[PDB]
Swiss-Prot record, chain A:
SUPFAM superfamilies: Nucleic acid-binding proteins (SSF50249). The lineage of its organism: Eukaryota, Metazoa, Chordata, Craniata, Vertebrata. Disulfide bonds: none annotated. It comes from Oryctolagus cuniculus (Rabbit). There is a cross-link at K36 (Glycyl lysine isopeptide (Lys-Gly) (interchain with G-Cter in SUMO2)). Transmembrane segments: none annotated. This is Small ribosomal subunit protein uS12. Component of the ribosome, a large ribonucleoprotein complex responsible for the synthesis of proteins in the cell. The small ribosomal subunit (SSU) binds messenger RNAs (mRNAs) and translates the encoded message by selecting cognate aminoacyl-transfer RNA (tRNA) molecules. The large subunit (LSU) contains the ribosomal catalytic site termed the peptidyl transferase center (PTC), which catalyzes the formation of peptide bonds, thereby polymerizing the amino acids delivered by tRNAs into a polypeptide chain. Coiled coil: none annotated. It comes from the Eukaryota. It holds the Pfam family Ribosom_S12_S23.
UniProtKB/Swiss-Prot annotation, chain B:
Coiled coil: none annotated. Component of the 40S subunit of the ribosome. This is Small ribosomal subunit protein eS30. It comes from the Eukaryota. Component of the 40S subunit of the ribosome. Contributes to the assembly and function of 40S ribosomal subunits. It is found in: Cytoplasm; Nucleus. The modification N6-succinyllysine is found at K49. The chain holds residues 77 to 133 of 133 of the full protein.
Length: 141, 57, 185, 55
RNA sequence: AGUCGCCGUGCCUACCAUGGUGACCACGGGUGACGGGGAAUCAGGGUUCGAUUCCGGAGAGGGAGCCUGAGAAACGGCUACCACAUCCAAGGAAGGCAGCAGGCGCGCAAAUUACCCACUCCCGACCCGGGGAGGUAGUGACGAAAAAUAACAAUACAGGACUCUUUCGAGGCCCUGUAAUUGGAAUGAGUCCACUUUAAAUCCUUUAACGAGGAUCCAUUGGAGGGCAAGUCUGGUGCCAGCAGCCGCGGUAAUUCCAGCUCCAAUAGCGUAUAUUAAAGUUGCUGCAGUUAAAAAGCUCGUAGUUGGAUCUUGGGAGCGGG
């Protein structure tokens, strides 16, 4: 059972300490391994350079092509894949366009029917792609 | 990879319909009166069939 | 280092369950009755009331014959009787828990000018207050949410510099008499 | 505030109030011009009618 | 026992002794470590942040050594080495914005080379001089408080509550809405006199002359299968394009895609990403579990630790006050 004395505090306080590491979230945060291995240095957004444009296939019960891009970063130098959410919007992207990327919403985990994508593009050439879609603006030719 | 030729198919394949004008609707405080006098007492049909505010039929 | 204040708090709180279908009726009901613009103004009143209700709930948990309770408890009663919500003949600090939102809405100005004639379709009342036609014992007020005391409900009338309350007519009527005299005729 | 005499005024009175009325006058040199020169006059030593010239 | 030190002390020097710390976690290493008063969340207990206007400490490119002085190992004081860097007549000389503005780079990411010593206070030989300490305007949807974008009365009836009516229907107490802006009233936003405020100016407030017909002085951001409040409407597409936090939608009749009407929620604000609290009684002191769902060492002894049986002056009274 449980210790439950009047002068047992060192034991309990100890027991909770070494036994808290067996929780996934605490362990992830308070160790640097996930942090130094995250392409973003504990950050939300990041700018980077385009170097390819590819199409990723989906999972089994669906069938499509999800129009992603290979992207290199400025600060770190690493490489990643990213997704372009909307109909007809890949054509808005040229080569070497200095985009801004972000997460998707699951904090490091893959989302949906895409095999291994956890970043989405937001701003190309500093003109707010969503606005560009809606026709509130055009690109800086 | 794959076949990227077919981007923006449907969004370019659809016709261009235009919109209309009807009015500007009341804004702010008057609009809340509209909802009150519309919902809780306007004409009060006793039997609603649990029918909704946009049920088109 | 500067001479500034930085002190500021909020005056409302959002609920936890946004779509419930059972309170949206009550909220919108209160609005069309007492004549407001937002849900937010309601949320303020609940925040006042909870805090009153909070403090009185703690004084009860204190024992009796305690000088703090006999100071603050007698003091709080005195405000709600001054404001005119709570009523004399009962000052017991346990009849405070049986208080509702409507008492503090009835006690605003927009209502009193309406219940006191003078307004004619309460949405009119607010428009008058904001158009600067009204005064309280000496002074004009441009604010509907002005809680009116009980000492000072016998002294409300139109401000004196209005077309209504003994003054010069307005931009329109001053250019139609112009037509009666030298314009149209 | 009322004073007994006009001379006691400028004995104990702020100047900006005085210059409201046409009574006191104030000199002006913008205080950037002025201290600019003040940091000059320190690169020349002692010469009286030079420092009075202010270069 | 003495030297040095403003003074006490292995702080230092000589001669002796062999001691000091440790499972009640020393020692060593890491810190996205300046500390605290405090901030957010919060039934009760707790979890996380705290560079940041107050107190204390440290530093002035990295290191070391000093003069003056009551007080400094000063840096808007000196001298050297290192790294950098400006003049140059090529002999030599001058340097330290983590002070106010400004610039380059850096990056997801952060304002004007502005005016004044008028307030607050400081310094000096001083009622008189100086102060990018400090005040004051400028950029500012980090954030917090109040509050506009219409009100009214006739014209009609979809109709309703009621007087009357075997039905319609007459008084309309009373209500709503759509069309006629039918109708005149009231206001400020916005121009621009004047005063006041101000060191001098601006803003607020006060006040003359102008200033609204609802095609205009035009309220957005997100959504409509469920969770979750709101369309089995219309056209196009055909496991393609695409949506979708999760379940899932699309393979010619799509409640989910591309569009139009219609509706729903918050409202001058609303979405998106990432940390961080509650929900989490899914880290459990308050308060989990351990036959089969994850889980009790093969069995026994055993030091530190934690926890430990019963028992020693009770009444009866006395001064009192109530039912
Ligand atoms: Mg600062
Ligand atoms: Mg540090
Ligand atoms: Mg601190
Ligand atoms: Mg120092
Ligand atoms: Mg530096
Ligand atoms: Mg130094
Ligand atoms: Mg210094
Ligand atoms: Mg310096
Ligand atoms: Mg600077
Ligand atoms: Mg910013
Ligand atoms: Mg606000
Ligand atoms: Mg739709
Ligand atoms: Mg939904
Ligand atoms: Mg948590
Ligand atoms: Mg709980
Ligand atoms: Mg469990
Ligand atoms: Mg978990
Ligand atoms: Mg419990
Ligand atoms: Mg098992
Ligand atoms: Mg015992």
């Amino acid at each position: 059972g449980k210790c439950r004395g009047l002068r047992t505090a060192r034991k309990l306080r100890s027991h909770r300490r070494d036994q808290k590491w067996h929780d996934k979230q605490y362990k992830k945060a308070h160790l640097g391994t996930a942090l130094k291995a995250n392409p973003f240095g504990g950050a939300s957004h990041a700018k980077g350079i385009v170097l390819e444009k590819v199409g990723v296939e989906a999972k089994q019960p669906n069938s499509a092509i999800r129009k992603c891009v290979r992207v290199q970063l400025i600060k770190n130098g690493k490489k990643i894949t990213a997704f372009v959410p909307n109909d007809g919007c890949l054509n808005f992207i040229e080569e070497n366009d200095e985009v801004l990327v972000a997460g998707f919403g699951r904090k490091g985990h893959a989302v949906g029917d895409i095999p291994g994508v956890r970043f989405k593009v937001v701003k190309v050439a500093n003109v707010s792609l969503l606005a560009l879609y809606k026709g509130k603006k055009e690109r800086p030719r | 990879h794959g076949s990227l030729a077919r981007v923006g198919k449907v969004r370019g394949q659809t016709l261009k319909v235009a919109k209309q004008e009807k009015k500007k609707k009341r804004t702010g405080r008057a609009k809340r009166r509209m909802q009150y006098n519309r919902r809780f007492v306007n004409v009060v049909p006793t039997f609603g069939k649990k029918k909704g505010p946009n049920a088109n039929s | 280092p500067v001479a500034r204040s930085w002190v500021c708090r909020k005056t409302y709180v959002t609920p936890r369950r946004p779509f419930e279908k059972s309170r949206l009726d009550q909220e919108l009901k209160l609005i069309g009755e007492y004549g407001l613009r937002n849900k937010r103004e309601v949320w303020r009143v609940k925040f006042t009331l909870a805090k009153i209700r909070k403090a009185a709930r703690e004084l009860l948990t204190l024992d009796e014959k305690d000088p703090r309770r006999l100071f603050e408890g007698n003091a709080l009663l005195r405000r709600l009787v001054r404001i005119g919500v709570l009523d004399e003949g009962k000052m017991k600090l346990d009849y405070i828990l049986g208080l509702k939102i409507e008492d503090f809405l009835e006690r605003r100005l927009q209502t009193q000018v309406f219940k006191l004639g003078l307004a004619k379709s309460i949405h009119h009342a607010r428009v008058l207050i904001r158009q600067r036609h009204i005064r309280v014992r000496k002074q004009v007020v441009n604010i509907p949410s002005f809680i009116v005391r009980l000492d000072s409900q016998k002294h409300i009338d139109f401000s004196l510099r209005s077309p209504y309350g003994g003054g010069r007519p307005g931009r329109v009527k001053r250019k139609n008499a112009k037509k009666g005299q030298g314009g149209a005729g | 505030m009322i004073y007994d005499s006009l001379d006691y005024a400028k004995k104990n009175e702020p100047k900006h109030r005085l210059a409201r009325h046409g009574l006191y006058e104030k000199k002006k040199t913008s205080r950037k011009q002025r201290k600019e020169r003040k940091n000059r006059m320190k690169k020349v030593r002692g010469t009286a009618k030079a420092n009075v010239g202010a270069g």
